[PDB]
């Protein structure tokens, strides 16, 4: 019927002045654009069909052609930036927002989808969607006593589109748009659907990826305990954005970091720091490095939760970029911690895997490790036990690597090495 039409035939029907002929041709374009194997988006654009699709969005008395056009335009908007731009240039943004209030749920859902693709292109189209007034009708679709009464596919599309309005930087979304979206987002973050939960966490991870003021807007809505709960989910599509959000929050102030600790997040990190998915381990270790950059009472909580052995573990064996986050974790720890906390680090076995990483060719991890060694020696000087640390570094081959780095291209790997040799190995 409408399967495998030529673009020429589609143009012919759409250019007829017969609404039923145009409906059939539009559905045929929708089916062409729905195939996974290179949908001919550019050929449809080059045929000049986008203005006609957009005008069909307004045919209130022919809801089928509204749906088919909406679907066709959604899939053009799903392509490259240039292809999304063609949809925007055709006037689709206000026409889709007008469809949000359609009495046909499948048509308003398709308008939700299309705006999600347009907003997802980048911050400019995101902010342009916001300026046309998309947020109010979107949130009104979710203004129900219980989200569970909404169709699951519909709720997932609404959640995903809302998270694209939260997405991207330079610039971040407008402050007032974020404040307007946040209470609905908090409610979606407590819903029981795994996809809604994943996309809600993604939205929160975008909003917390910024300055401390952006983090605070989220943290003050009280979502940190729910994020920590989702941190323990069995669904990796949920854990990944939940962890990104938690890690984003601990890039903020010590007070914002403390609320992550208060919420019980550190008890999940034995699993996260041994998680089979290397990017979970990397993100978890980066998060740990920002926690060990906090106060001494926050370092103490890391100790209390038994997490220093887990840092020794990832330093000993992990993907290199995780090992580098672990190196940062130790340097931050030794920079801010007490003498007793630093001594405990040595007792857990940090020295030998620390020395082994001086073999790496990454020059700034060598700088990071050399700073941690200097920090630990400074703690050992306060105790009069510099020589035991010297011999410890000696027996694991660490001294050989320190004096090897005396022969290094970088000017500070140069001097840090010789300085440590000068003062502690004479």
């Amino acid at each position: 019927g409408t399967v495998n039409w030529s673009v020429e035939d589609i143009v012919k029907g759409i250019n007829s002045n017969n609404l039923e002929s145009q409906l059939q041709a539009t559905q045929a374009a929708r089916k062409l654009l729905s195939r996974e194997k290179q949908p001919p988006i550019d050929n449809i654009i080059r045929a000049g069909l986008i203005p006609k699709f957009v005008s069909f969005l307004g045919k209130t008395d022919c809801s089928p052609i509204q749906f088919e056009s909406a679907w066709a335009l959604t899939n053009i908007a799903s392509g490259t930036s240039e292809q999304t731009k063609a949809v925007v240039d055709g006037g689709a943004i206000p026409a889709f927002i007008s469809l949000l209030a359609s009495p046909h749920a499948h048509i308003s859902e398709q308008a939700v989808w299309a705006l999600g693709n347009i907003a997802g292109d980048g911050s400019a189209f995101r902010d342009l969607v916001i300026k046309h007034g998309a947020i109010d009708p979107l949130l009104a679709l979710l203004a129900v006593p219980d989200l569970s009464t909404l169709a699951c596919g519909y709720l997932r599309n609404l959640t995903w589109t809302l998270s694209n309005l939260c997405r991207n930087k330079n610039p971040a979304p407008p402050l007032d748009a974020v404040e307007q979206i946040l209470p609905t987002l908090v409610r979606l973050l407590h819903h029981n659907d795994p996809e809604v939960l994943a996309d809600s966490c993604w939205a929160i991870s975008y909003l917390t990826d910024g300055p401390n003021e952006r983090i605070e807007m989220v943290v003050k809505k009280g979502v940190v305990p729910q994020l920590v709960k989702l941190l323990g989910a069995t669904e990796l599509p949920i854990v990944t954005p939940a962890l990104r959000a938690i890690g984003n929050i601990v890039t903020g102030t010590d007070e914002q970091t403390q609320k992550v600790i208060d919420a019980g997040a550190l008890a999940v990190f034995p699993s996260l720091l041994t998680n089979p998915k290397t990017n979970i381990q990397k993100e978890a270790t980066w998060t740990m490095s920002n926690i060990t950059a906090g106060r001494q009472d926050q370092i103490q909580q890391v100790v209390n939760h038994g997490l220093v052995p887990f840092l020794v573990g990832v330093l000993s064996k992990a993907d290199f970029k995780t090992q580098k986050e672990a190196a940062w974790a130790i340097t931050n720890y030794t920079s801010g911690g007490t003498v007793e906390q630093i001594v405990y680090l040595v007792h857990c076995g940090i020295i030998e895997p620390l020395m082994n990483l001086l073999s790496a060719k990454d020059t700034k991890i060598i700088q990071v490790i050399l700073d941690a060694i200097s920090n630990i020696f400074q703690a050992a000087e306060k105790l009069g036990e510099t020589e035991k640390l010297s011999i410890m570094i000696e027996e694991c081959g660490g001294l050989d690597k320190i004096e090897a780095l005396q022969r290094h291209e970088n000017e500070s790997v140069y001097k840090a090495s010789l300085n440590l040799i000068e003062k502690y190995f004479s």
Binding site: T251, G252, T253, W286, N290, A293, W328, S335, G336
Partner: peptide
Amino acid sequence: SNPAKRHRE
């Protein structure tokens, strides 16, 4: 506030 904090690298 805390200068030791690091963003993603």
